[PDB]
Amino acid sequence: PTGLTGNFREDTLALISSLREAIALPENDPNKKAAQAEARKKLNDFFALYRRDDSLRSLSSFMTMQTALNSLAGHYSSYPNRPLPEKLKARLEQEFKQVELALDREAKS
Ligand SMILES: [Cl-]
Incomplete structure (x- = not known):
């Protein structure tokens, strides 16, 4: 039902990939809104x-992913009918990259 495994690293990496796909779709793709609703x-x-x-909750991977996911949610809540601005998309992508770096650092600690 959720598609979540309960493995935090696997789920976070999968969510990052899903979110990247949804955001990367053209504004005029027929499936854009649906992909959005599914991201939420x-x-x-x-x-x-x-x-x-x-x-x-104590981990940097978690904290950064929470910052990202909150910024995405907040855009929708404030501007439900406008696309993510390029500047937000760029920040989200930096954040995703940071989460991935943090997951690997955590695994080797
Ligand atoms: Cl709006």
């Missing part, structure tokens, strides 16, 4: 599962 659902599902785990 998936980020909500991800927080619903993982925010209850205070181990994960």
